[PDB]
């Protein structure tokens, strides 16, 4: 029965992420029209001023998709270009004042998702959460 | 830490299905060059002779993607067209003798995937599998 439940559970995630890149539980409270990745790019740029290369490394997406998402992001006056004193085809990205609340929302939407996972876990005792933790460790390794 | 582990586990599935539609664990033993969905279409057609509409319902994919996959499937002499005595734009699909071992492989790769899930579950006792089952029930409902 557990074999069929694991197949069912993984199947539900498949349907849920047929067009999404990341899993975010709840609804997006952003007033601006931006995709999952686009809003996340603003989130990582808020904490640290990142280059075109680091965005691809953090998001785990292709640099071709990065330039495609960054061009639509700078179009809506959300991100601004910057270049170092020792240029080695280096393009640093900075966050504008227009993007600051959007990045704040996504960071809150990520902690909102984790808090819902925390609740589901808190239904079980410390010794029960260990059994779940051990399972999710073995299962996650099949997808690595 | 469980909230972070759930976020990590779901993330590993995200990376796994970035180009996949269904989760199959193990390498594909098929000698013919066909995609995940293409080899799954042959599997469902082997047991029951399905119409162009039921394929979209079973696979949970758009009928536009169905015709795109069915045209490449009939090209390699794997599937054959059929029409009823009372035609109401009905296009029934039948499996050829060339496709029979391919559908058999896929069905065995799905049982190979379930058997690996069975193993991971069998590591835990009957009372421990209940704790996991209760968790996966509550978690799967967030993606429904
Ligand atoms: Zn995000
Ligand atoms: Zn958001
Ligand atoms: Zn399949
Ligand atoms: Zn196969």
Residue numbers in the entry:
A (entry chain A), B (entry chain B): 2 to 145
Wording from the paper:
The structure of ZitRMG holo-form was first determined at low resolution by single anomalous wavelength dispersion (SAD) and then, after crystal improvement by molecular replacement, at 2.8 Å resolution. The asymmetric unit (ASU) contained 8 ZitRMG molecules, and 16 Zn(II) atoms. ZitRMG molecules formed four dimers (AB, CD, EF and GH), all binding four Zn(II) atoms in total (two per protomer). In AB, both protomers have almost the same conformation and superimpose to each other with all 1144 atoms-RMSD of 0.34 Å. Each protomer is arranged from the N- to the C-terminus as follows: α1 (residues 3–17), α2 (residues 37–48), α3 (residues 53–60), α4 (residues 64–77), β1 (residues 80–83), β2 (residues 93–96), α5 (residues 100–124) and α6 (residues 127–144), in good agreement with our above-mentioned CD results, and as expected for a typical MarR superfamily member. In ZitRMG dimerization interface, the N-terminal α1 helix (protomer A), which is stacking between α5'-α6' helices, interacts with α1’, its counterpart in protomer B, and the same holds true for the C-terminal α6 and α6' helices. In ZitRMG like in E. coli MarR, streptococcal AdcR proteins and ZitRIL, the DNA-binding domain is folded as a wHTH domain made of a helix region (formed by α2, α3 and α4 helices) and a β strand region (β1 and β2 strands). The two metal binding sites of ZitRMG protein, like those of ZitRIL and AdcRSpne, are located at opposite sides of the dimer and two Zn(II) ions are bound per protomer. Glu23ZitR, His41ZitR and His111ZitR are moderately exposed, while His107ZitR is buried. Zn(II) is clearly coordinated by Oε1-Glu23ZitR, Nδ1-His41ZitR, Nε2-His107ZitR and Nε2-His111ZitR, although a supplementary coordination involving a second atom of the first ligand (Oε2) has also been proposed in AdcRSpne (see below). The three Zn(II) ligands in ZitRMG site 2: SH-Cys29ZitR, Oε1-Glu40ZitR (a buried residue), and Oε1-Glu106ZitR, are the same as in ZitRIL and AdcRSpne. Interestingly, ZitRMG is shown here to better align to the DNA-bound form of any MarR protein than to its DNA-free counterpart, suggesting that holo-ZitRMG dimer could be folded in a DNA-binding prone conformation.
In this study, we have characterized ZitRMG, a metallo-regulator of the MarR superfamily. In L. lactis subspecies cremoris strain MG1363, we have showed that ZitR repressor controls an emergency response to Zn(II) starvation, allowing Zn(II) uptake under extreme conditions, while impeding it in a wide concentration range, from repletion to toxicity. In solution, ZitRMG has been shown to be a stable dimer able to bind, as expected, both Zn(II) and double-stranded DNA fragments bearing the palindromic TTAACYRGTTAA recognition sequence. ZitRMG protein is folded as a triangular-shaped homo-dimer with a two-fold pseudo-symmetric axis, a typical topology for a MarR superfamily member.
